[PDB]
Scaffold this active site. Structure first.
Site, PDB file in Angstrom:
ATOM      1  N   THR D   1      38.078  27.408  30.307  1.00  0.00           N
ATOM      2  CA  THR D   1      37.111  26.361  30.911  1.00  0.00           C
ATOM      3  C   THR D   1      37.618  25.437  30.124  1.00  0.00           C
ATOM      4  O   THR D   1      38.125  24.350  31.138  1.00  0.00           O
ATOM      5  CB  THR D   1      35.842  26.777  30.166  1.00  0.00           C
ATOM      6  OG1 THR D   1      35.884  27.502  29.016  1.00  0.00           O
ATOM      7  CG2 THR D   1      34.946  27.190  30.963  1.00  0.00           C
TER       8      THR D   1
HETATM    9  C1  LDZ Z   1      39.275  33.340  30.365  1.00  0.00           C
HETATM   10  C2  LDZ Z   1      37.950  32.635  30.632  1.00  0.00           C
HETATM   11  C3  LDZ Z   1      37.696  32.787  28.885  1.00  0.00           C
HETATM   12  C4  LDZ Z   1      37.265  32.347  30.913  1.00  0.00           C
HETATM   13  C5  LDZ Z   1      36.030  32.614  31.451  1.00  0.00           C
HETATM   14  C6  LDZ Z   1      35.022  30.414  31.100  1.00  0.00           C
HETATM   15  O1  LDZ Z   1      33.828  31.034  31.289  1.00  0.00           O
HETATM   16  N1  LDZ Z   1      36.398  32.381  32.700  1.00  0.00           N
HETATM   17  C7  LDZ Z   1      34.929  32.900  33.550  1.00  0.00           C
HETATM   18  O2  LDZ Z   1      34.602  33.791  33.349  1.00  0.00           O
HETATM   19  C8  LDZ Z   1      35.433  33.695  34.405  1.00  0.00           C
HETATM   20  C9  LDZ Z   1      34.431  31.899  35.170  1.00  0.00           C
HETATM   21  C10 LDZ Z   1      35.712  31.890  36.614  1.00  0.00           C
HETATM   22  C11 LDZ Z   1      36.172  32.359  37.745  1.00  0.00           C
HETATM   23  C12 LDZ Z   1      35.464  30.219  36.646  1.00  0.00           C
HETATM   24  N2  LDZ Z   1      34.392  34.545  35.086  1.00  0.00           N
HETATM   25  C13 LDZ Z   1      33.684  36.000  34.118  1.00  0.00           C
HETATM   26  O3  LDZ Z   1      35.394  36.309  33.742  1.00  0.00           O
HETATM   27  C14 LDZ Z   1      32.731  36.904  34.642  1.00  0.00           C
HETATM   28  C15 LDZ Z   1      33.072  38.148  33.495  1.00  0.00           C
HETATM   29  C16 LDZ Z   1      31.769  37.284  32.531  1.00  0.00           C
HETATM   30  C17 LDZ Z   1      31.333  38.449  31.452  1.00  0.00           C
HETATM   31  C18 LDZ Z   1      32.009  36.211  31.397  1.00  0.00           C
HETATM   32  N3  LDZ Z   1      32.869  37.346  35.563  1.00  0.00           N
HETATM   33  C19 LDZ Z   1      33.567  38.300  36.758  1.00  0.00           C
HETATM   34  O4  LDZ Z   1      34.905  38.681  36.020  1.00  0.00           O
HETATM   35  O5  LDZ Z   1      33.546  38.743  37.886  1.00  0.00           O
HETATM   36  C20 LDZ Z   1      33.444  38.265  38.466  1.00  0.00           C
HETATM   37  C21 LDZ Z   1      35.727  37.150  39.276  1.00  0.00           C
HETATM   38  C22 LDZ Z   1      36.372  38.664  38.799  1.00  0.00           C
HETATM   39  C23 LDZ Z   1      37.157  38.098  39.282  1.00  0.00           C
HETATM   40  C24 LDZ Z   1      37.722  36.842  39.049  1.00  0.00           C
HETATM   41  C25 LDZ Z   1      36.296  35.365  38.655  1.00  0.00           C
HETATM   42  C26 LDZ Z   1      35.813  36.300  38.730  1.00  0.00           C
END
Ligand code: LDZ
Ligand code: LDZ
Lengths: 123, 240, 238, 195, 73, 201, 213, 237, 215
Positions: D1
């Site tokens: 983030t």
């Molecule tokens: C490495 C992390 C600490 C950074 C985090 C920031 O919130 N990133 C994220 O959380 C990303 C969002 C991003 C694409 C904007 N989202 C995620 O990782 C979430 C899982 C939650 C339970 C946490 N969603 C997810 O992994 O499934 C859909 C997906 C699958 C692959 C890539 C991106 C998104």
């Protein structure tokens, strides 16, 4: 040179292991064939009934296809394998070419299967 | 002995003869001497000219494994050229994945593992060549290692591989390698090779001299022509 | 000798007999001679005939415009080796659009030969070669052995009766660099003539002459093409 | 983030927020974005939680084998190169941006930024993530060469705090790590640096 | 060379090459190569013995015998 | 484009137009759409030009090996089956070919239709191509098993000529081939323009 | 998304006379509306008697030209003879067909003297469809150039006109005039005209300037 | 021999390759085949040596057609010859398919030799051809160069021969050929010469059933099964 | 690379008597943002060749690693043979074509300049595999905003001295700065000559903003 090894040659020039295979054919029951103007006929011998043994299972003369029939002389089990493979090819030839197998083709196929076993050790 | 035929088979006493037979071929080869001076490592090989039809530089026994690392080989040259390629590949992959030039200690361990693997399997004969690896780095300083045909690698202030390994090692011990400057050391290497040459038995020989060090800026270049010529003159005068 | 069974078995005397025996195979083939001037490299070979009616066997092959090869040892291995050489050269003209350095090809020929020597299952290659080529750094004559050792040679002869040729080359090695193409060829065939038994003599049918130069792509001259080089020859010494 | 790294002469100061978000839901309000790749090398991860967690664990395993094998402390440049090689090879598959900042005896405190392409650049200050766009000006305005560790720690806390307020994705707590020859000191700021 | 001292050897003959060819030869066999080479030259009526005549002696001493075999040429 | 084949009492008649078109542009007016597989076998081609030329050449090679190995020339039905089997493997991959394999064999005069879609059928009269629909009408009206050889040639020449007039992608000289027991003969090749003066009058 | 092909422009022409074959090409590499180079001649001389012209995506034209050259050498080693113009045409059809499912976007015209010594032109579609022709033009301006050759070399649509055999001198003049007119109406065609004449003595190259707009 | 003949893998102390020489020996078991190359064309003659009256003469194939311009004669193992003959037949057709031209006799001989050479490459079709082939093939054909006759041997070695003999009695036939052969010999003169040599070197009388003759000439095609002219030529001689 | 991530902008090359000059901005842009403002897009391959790249940097960094390893590998051989500028152009063309066929392209347009054997070489390699050798070359927006100036000067005078050619490159680089959004005023110039490849450091171009006052 050496008799034992299908691929070793001999100083004279002979693959003895292949010739040793011909001996098993001689020890097999006699079978004869003639070419007739309209009735090609093959004859077999040594029914050798064993009293309490059924003779439907013994099948020295086995047909390969409607137009071609075969009589084997030699080890019984090895013959069963060659007859079945020839039977599959006859049907496959019809699937690949919609014409019945000419007799020469099935004999060339049987010769090729037999040659492939001769070519390498482990067979 | 019967049990001597297979590398995979241990002898009843507990040794593998096939590994030993590889070393004796290394012993038959012409000597190669390497000395670790404080400013880098200098390598000299008693290459033997044969026939005289062969042009100079033919059948070189000194090879560049990496820009910094350099190798001297004693034994069947063909086996050595294969080992050089294996080392060149390992250095290539290391810069390729890790991002930095291969540490000599790691490259030596990896080439030794390839030599070690050949000993354990019946299909492949153990490698018949012994080689030494030398490089200069600011971070690690000068480093010299020797790998035998059995794939054993240990650090050496000075080492000789070939027929005169014992005779040359006695001469090498006298030199003050720990503090000697490399330019002076090159002259000493020429003399040590000339002492162990046994020229009457070996007929003609061509000296090959290799240099890696602060002077070379960490590049295993062949000693520049004329620097070798002076070393050859110093050795010839010392011999007589 | 029970240590002579395989190329994967070390002798108790620290030698590998199978590799040495493979080198003997090179000896059974006919003599081939290569010499290089400053600008031209020439390989001259004697072609044996299995039958009098039959044509003489090929002794020289064309790898590329920049590289040519002479054969001694098994014809079987030579054809396998020549094919590797041709593929490597054409790939260099494709991937890099540059005539392959002859020295780099010799190193590749050597690397393949070592794998049979170090591992069981294939005979060590039984053919010796006399590569002749012109690259950026000038004419190069290289000789190869079943052992996987390659030597850069100003002039060399491999095969049966070769030592007589090598001795003529040793005496005449100094004048080779400055001589013109006709002289370089005349010296090369003269070295081959020494290999010939006294009764036999060089003839258009029995001699193959191959020349690669700065201004000449590798060209094999045989039959009448060999005749200008053969003519004007010194009478055989008696 | 929001992830940021600043290199002082004797070390690196690495900081990040604590928010993992699925859509507009915060899965974890207290996430340790900064992870120890080795004793003196840390990576702050932005992008996909699963992809980042996997590549970091994979590099930690590869670096650990390399350090025991070579019997030497690992250089930061190799640690960045291991992350870069994986990111470039699996560029289409992975969605991760990583800041590899660590102290190495040979080259000192260093900060390497691997963008999602797998490109690698060594930067005096690197900021990454959704919040990075918001603080690009403050980072290239308040950065002065030769800032002390205390000043760099203040800079990171302030820059991350300004981005967290603007970015919905970034918020919560600021996790700060300073890496030096002595080692790593980790502090959690409970949303301090309010402006 | 010691045995061939009496014989009229050509200066061209190189003993070292012949020695490399004669691996695993007892000293008497080395003498035999020299004795046979002299007769081989006598058969062709040669005034002096060339290196090739010595090579023929090595084959005769080994009882190997030599011929073109094809698969070689 | 336009290919017609009919088996009458005195052998089989195969005729085809000579035009190849890249989109609207006419690539050529001299195309040969009959491949002479054997002295007794002719295979006509329609649909994508490249697909037909390579695949018929592959059958021609397969047949010559069959003649050499079995010592007997291949059957028309075997030839059609071989081409059909090879095309079927590449199905849904966009191959476009429509062909008629016609020859005199031991069984008798034989004409077969092979399609890239996998359709192999045998028939007395077949027309394949863009102008197949036009050729079929004129050939169908006026086709007799007892047609005289000269008359059979004229029906074929007219059927291609009328088809060329209606079909834009069909045009050029009409190639007339007669398959008989002795073997195929190229009767004649006539430009549509010359035929247009004679046939129209 | 990645698009595997681009149109780099260019036009090729081959006219085959009794003793001569003229393969000529414009020399402009053009991408989109920009001009990549004003000197990229399409004609490539595969052998002494054979010249090929490749127009279309340049990367495809370059690869095919290297493949044809490697294969001519492969044949020369195998058969100890040069591939004849008809054999080069046949081989090209197979290579183009091999990538039937990933087509080489190259329009190819092979022009050379045949084994008899008479000029031969073989024209190929992108997947391989050679037909021997007296005259053929291919490329961006293929449509404009082909009809003139039909009118004059062909004598088509002409009545009460002697069918005099084409002379090398007249043929060169037609080659230039079709191209000079083509540059006028084709955005992709212009710059220079590379003309290759295959004659018993050998290939000769002549360059004629064309509009550079 | 003395051991070292167990495999083509092993090399003799002399450096000779045994097994390859043993396969060369197998050709001697074959019936003699004589081929003469003349400007008019190439003539191939063979001794059929029919084992029994009952067996059909056609099934023994000593002369076979590789292509219209090329004919082959085989002395040696029947099964081994078939594998090589099939490759030559596929290759001539494949060269036509790829290059739209007739393959030269030398190129077919070279292509067949390439399979013959793989006695033990250890890479190609592993588990196939672990031993050398035992058949010597005489390839007689008219190509662009002109009439050419080429002899291949079990070791992959091929050569152009004006006149050649293969099989048992090959040695006797070659000596006779050197005396009889001359450059200006017509095909007709060569055909008579081949059968005369065959009659001298075959124990059985040279009746039409005993000898099979073949001739390839530029004007005609293979024409390598003279039939009933076998009786006509023999009676005239 | 199906999608480019951080991409460099135009690279300009002009041959000069005795060598070639290549100029490229030191900027890497993630979309509009100029994320990296100190990145060298010019690489020295060997001592007679230099390469300038436009497009995904990660692909160029990979190509730089592969091309460099190849030069190090040839140097280890030390046989007196070194790759020419034309040979580097061929390898890049083969690599770029192969990548295109696999449908996994390297997203880069590259300019290879070298002076060898008295002859300057300037070459263009597209992602698709299009390659040509030219007197002048420009990539990205530059071919539209720079090659016209270069072509007019090069046509009027065929051979340009090093000073004149370096002046032309600086003049064009300013034009890219004014009219290319992805451009940065921190270019670097590399020159190949018999002396060798020298890559000049951060440079900037004087910019006239006087037109602003006149509406
Ligand atoms: C490495 C992390 C600490 C950074 C985090 C920031 O919130 N990133 C994220 O959380 C990303 C969002 C991003 C694409 C904007 N989202 C995620 O990782 C979430 C899982 C939650 C339970 C946490 N969603 C997810 O992994 O499934 C859909 C997906 C699958 C692959 C890539 C991106 C998104
Ligand atoms: C020789 C005959 C079989 C051709 C005949 C059959 O209808 N007439 C034709 O007009 C055919 C059929 C077409 C309308 C689909 N035309 C064609 O095949 C034309 C031009 C030829 C000279 C090769 N080719 C064409 O349109 O595109 C073929 C193609 C397919 C894939 C990739 C690239 C090119």
């Amino acid at each position: 040179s050496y008799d034992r090894a299908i691929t070793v040659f001999s100083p004279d020039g002979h693959l003895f292991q292949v010739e040793y295979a011909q001996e098993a054919v001689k020890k097999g029951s006699t079978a004869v064939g003639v070419r007739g103007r309209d009735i090609v006929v093959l004859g077999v011998e040594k029914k050798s009934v064993a009293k309490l043994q059924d003779e439907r299972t013994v099948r020295k003369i086995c047909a390969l296809d409607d137009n071609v029939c075969m009589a084997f002389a030699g080890l019984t089990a090895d013959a069963r394998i060659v007859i079945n493979r020839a039977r599959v090819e006859c049907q496959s030839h019809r699937l690949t070419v919609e014409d019945p197998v000419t007799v020469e083709y099935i004999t060339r196929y049987i010769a090729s299967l037999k040659q492939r076993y001769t070519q390498s050790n482990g067979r | 002995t019967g049990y001597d035929l297979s590398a995979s088979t241990f002898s009843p006493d507990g040794r593998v003869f096939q590994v030993e037979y590889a070393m004796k071929a290394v012993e038959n080869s012409s000597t190669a001497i390497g000395i670790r001076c404080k400013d880098g490592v200098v390598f000299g090989v008693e290459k033997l000219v044969l026939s005289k039809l062969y042009e100079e530089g033919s059948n070189k026994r000194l090879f560049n494994v990496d820009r910094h690392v350099g190798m001297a080989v004693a034994g069947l040259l063909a086996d050595a050229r294969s080992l050089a390629d294996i080392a060149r590949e390992e250095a290539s992959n290391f810069r390729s994945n890790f991002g930095y030039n291969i540490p000599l200690k790691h490259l030596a361990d990896r080439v030794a593992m390839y030599v070690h693997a050949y000993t354990l399997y019946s299909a492949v004969r153990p490698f018949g060549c012994s080689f030494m690896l030398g490089s200069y780095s600011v971070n690690d300083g000068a480093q010299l290692y020797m790998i035998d045909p059995s794939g054993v690698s240990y650090g050496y202030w000075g080492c000789a591989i070939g027929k005169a390994r014992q005779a040359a090692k006695t001469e090498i011990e006298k030199l003050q390698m720990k503090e000697m400057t490399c330019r002076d050391i090159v002259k000493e290497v020429a003399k040590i090779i000339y002492i162990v040459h046994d020229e009457v038995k070996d007929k003609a020989f061509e000296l090959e001299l290799s240099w890696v060090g602060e002077l070379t800026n960490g590049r295993h270049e062949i000693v520049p022509k004329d620097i070798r010529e002076e070393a050859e003159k110093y050795a010839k005068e010392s011999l007589k | 000798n029970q240590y002579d069974n395989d190329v994967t078995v070390w002798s108790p005397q620290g030698r590998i007999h199978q590799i040495e025996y493979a080198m003997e195979a090179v000896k059974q083939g006919s003599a081939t001679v290569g010499l290089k001037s400053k600008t031209h490299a020439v390989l001259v070979a004697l072609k044996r005939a299995q039958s009098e009616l039959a044509a003489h066997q090929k002794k020289i092959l064309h790898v590329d415009n920049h590289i040519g090869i002479s054969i001694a040892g098994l014809t079987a291995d030579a054809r396998l080796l020549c094919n590797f050489m041709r593929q490597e050269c054409l790939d260099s003209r494709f991937v890099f659009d540059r005539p392959l350095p002859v020295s780099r090809l010799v190193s590749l020929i050597g690397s393949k030969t070592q794998i049979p020597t170090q591992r069981y299952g294939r005979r060590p290659y039984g053919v010796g070669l006399l590569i002749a080529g012109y690259d950026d750094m000038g004419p190069h004559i290289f000789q190869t052995c079943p052992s996987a050792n390659y030597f850069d040679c100003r002039a060399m002869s491999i095969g049966a009766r070769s030592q007589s040729a090598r001795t003529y080359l040793e005496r005449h090695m100094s004048e080779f660099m400055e001589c013109n193409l006709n002289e370089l060829v005349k010296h090369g065939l003269r070295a081959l003539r020494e290999t010939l038994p006294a009764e036999q003599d060089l003839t258009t049918k029995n001699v193959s002459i191959g020349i690669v130069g700065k201004d000449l792509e590798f060209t094999i001259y045989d039959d009448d093409d060999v005749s200008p080089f053969l003519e004007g020859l010194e009478e055989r010494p008696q | 983030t929001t992830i940021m790294a600043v290199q002082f002469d004797g070390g690196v100061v690495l900081g990040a927020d604590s928010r993992t978000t699925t859509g507009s839901y915060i899965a974890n309000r207290v996430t340790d974005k900064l992870t120890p790749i080795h004793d003196r090398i840390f990576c702050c991860r932005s992008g996909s939680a699963a992809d980042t967690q996997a590549v970091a664990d994979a590099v930690t395993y590869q670096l650990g084998f390399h350090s025991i094998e070579l019997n030497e402390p690992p250089l930061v440049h190799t640690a960045a190169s291991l992350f870069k090689e994986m990111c470039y090879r699996y560029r289409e598959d992975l969605m991760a941006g990583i800041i590899i900042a660590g102290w190495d005896p040979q080259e000192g405190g260093q900060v390497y930024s691997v963008p999602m392409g797998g490109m690698m650049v060594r930067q005096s200050f690197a900021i990454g993530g959704s919040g990075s766009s918001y603080i690009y000006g403050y980072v290239d305005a308040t950065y002065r060469e030769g800032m002390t560790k205390e000043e760099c720690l203040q800079f990171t806390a302030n820059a991350l705090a300004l981005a967290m307020e603007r970015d919905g994705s970034s918020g919560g707590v600021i996790r700060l790590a300073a890496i030096a020859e002595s080692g790593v000191e980790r502090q959690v700021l409970l949303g301090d640096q309010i402006p | 060379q010691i045995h061939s001292r009496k014989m009229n050897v050509s200066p061209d003959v190189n003993y070292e090459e012949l020695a490399r060819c004669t691996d695993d030869f007892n000293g008497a066999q080395c003498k035999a190569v020299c004795v046979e080479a002299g007769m081989i030259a006598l058969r062709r009526g040669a005034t002096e013995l060339t290196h090739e005549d010595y090579m023929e002696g090595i084959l005769e001493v080994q009882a190997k015998k030599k011929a073109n075999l094809q698969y070689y040429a | 484009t336009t290919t017609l084949a009919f088996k009458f009492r005195h052998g089989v008649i195969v005729a085809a137009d000579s035009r190849a078109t890249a989109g609207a542009y006419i690539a050529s007016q001299t195309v040969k759409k009959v491949i002479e597989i054997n002295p007794y076998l002719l295979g006509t081609m329609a649909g994508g030009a490249a697909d037909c030329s390579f695949w018929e050449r592959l059958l021609a090679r397969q047949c010559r090996i069959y003649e050499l190995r079995n010592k007997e020339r291949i059957s028309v039905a075997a030839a059609s089956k071989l081409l059909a089997n090879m095309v079927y493997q590449y199905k849904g991959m966009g191959l476009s070919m429509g062909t008629m394999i016609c020859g005199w064999d031991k069984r008798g005069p034989g004409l077969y239709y092979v399609d890239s879609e996998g359709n192999r059928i045998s028939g007395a009269t077949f027309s394949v191509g863009s102008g197949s629909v036009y050729a079929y009408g004129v050939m169908d009206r006026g086709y007799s098993y007892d047609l005289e050889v000269e008359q059979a040639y004229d029906l074929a020449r007219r059927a291609i000529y009328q088809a060329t007039y209606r079909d834009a992608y069909s045009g050029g000289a009409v190639n007339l081939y007669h398959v008989r027991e002795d073997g195929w003969i190229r009767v004649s090749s006539d430009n549509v323009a010359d035929l247009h003066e004679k046939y129209s009058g | 998304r990645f698009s595997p092909y681009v149109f780099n422009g260019g036009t090729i022409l081959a006219i085959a006379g009794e003793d001569f074959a003229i393969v000529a090409s414009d020399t402009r590499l053009s991408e989109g509306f920009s001009i990549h180079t004003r000197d990229s001649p399409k004609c490539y001389k595969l052998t002494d008697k054979t010249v090929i012209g490749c127009s279309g995506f340049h990367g495809d034209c370059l690869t095919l030209t290297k493949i044809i050259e490697a294969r001519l050498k492969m044949y020369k080693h195998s058969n100890n003879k040069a591939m004849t113009t008809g054999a080069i045409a046949a081989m090209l059809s197979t290579i183009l067909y091999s990538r039937r499912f990933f087509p080489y976007y190259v329009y190819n015209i092979i022009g050379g003297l045949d084994e008899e010594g008479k000029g031969a032109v073989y024209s190929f579609d992108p997947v391989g469809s050679y037909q021997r022709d007296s005259f053929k033009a291919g490329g961006s301006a293929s449509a404009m150039l082909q009809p003139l050759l039909d009118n004059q070399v062909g004598f088509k649509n002409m009545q009460n006109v002697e069918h005099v055999p084409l002379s090398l001198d007249r043929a060169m003049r037609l080659v230039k005039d079709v191209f000079i007119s083509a540059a006028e109406r084709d955005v992709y065609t212009g710059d220079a005209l590379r003309i290759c004449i295959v004659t018993k003595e050998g290939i000769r190259e002549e360059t004629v300037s064309l509009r550079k707009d | 021999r003395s051991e070292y003949d167990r495999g083509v893998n092993t090399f003799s102390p002399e450096g000779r390759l045994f097994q390859v020489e043993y396969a060369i020996e197998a050709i001697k078991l074959g019936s003699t085949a004589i081929g003469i190359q003349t400007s008019e064309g190439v003539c191939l003659a063979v001794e059929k040596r029919i084992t029994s009256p009952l067996m059909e003469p056609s099934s023994i194939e000593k002369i076979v057609e590789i292509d219209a311009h090329i004919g082959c004669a085989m002395s040696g193992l029947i099964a081994d010859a078939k594998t090589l003959i099939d490759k030559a037949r596929v290759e001539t057709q494949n060269h036509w398919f790829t290059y739209n031209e007739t393959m030269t006799v030398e190129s077919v001989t070279q292509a067949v030799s390439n399979l013959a050479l793989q006695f033990g490459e250890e890479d190609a079709d592993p588990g196939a051809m672990s031993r050398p082939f035992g058949v010597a093939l005489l390839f007689g054909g008219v190509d662009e160069k002109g009439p050419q006759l080429f002899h291949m041997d079990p070791s992959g070695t091929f050569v152009q021969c004006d006149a050649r003999a293969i099989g048992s009695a090959s040695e006797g036939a070659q000596s006779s050929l050197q005396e009889v052969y001359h450059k200006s010999m017509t095909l007709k003169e060569a055909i008579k010469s081949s059968l005369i040599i065959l009659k001298q070197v075959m124990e059985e009388k040279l009746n039409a059933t005993n000898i099979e003759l073949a001739t390839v000439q530029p004007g005609q095609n293979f024409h390598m099964f003279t039939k009933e002219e076998l009786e006509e030529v023999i009676k005239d001689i | 690379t199906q999608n480019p991530m951080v991409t460099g902008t135009s690279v300009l090359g002009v041959k000069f008597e005795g060598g070639v000059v290549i100029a490229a901005d030191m900027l890497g842009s993630y979309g509009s943002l100029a994320r990296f403002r100190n990145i060298s897009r010019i690489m020295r391959v060997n001592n007679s060749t230099m390469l300038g790249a436009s497009g995904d940097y990660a692909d160029f960094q990979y190509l730089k690693q592969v091309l460099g390893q190849m030069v190090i590998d040839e140097e280890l051989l030390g046989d007196g043979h070194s790759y020419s500028p034309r040979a580097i152009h061929s390898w890049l063309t083969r690599a770029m074509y192969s990548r295109r066929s696999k449908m996994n392209p390297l997203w880069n347009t590259m300019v290879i300049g070298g002076y060898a054997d008295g002859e300057s070489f300037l070459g263009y390699v597209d992602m698709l595999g299009v390659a040509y050798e030219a007197p002048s070359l420009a990539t990205g927006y530059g071919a539209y905003l720079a090659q016209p100036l270069l072509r007019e000067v090069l046509e009027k005078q065929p051979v340009l001295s090093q000073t004149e050619a370096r002046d032309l490159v600086e003049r064009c680089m300013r034009v890219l700065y004014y009219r290319d959004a992805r451009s940065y005023n921190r270019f670097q110039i590399a020159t190949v000559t018999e002396k060798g490849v020298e890559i000049e450091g951060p440079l900037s171009t004087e910019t006239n903003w006087d037109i602003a006052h006149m509406i």
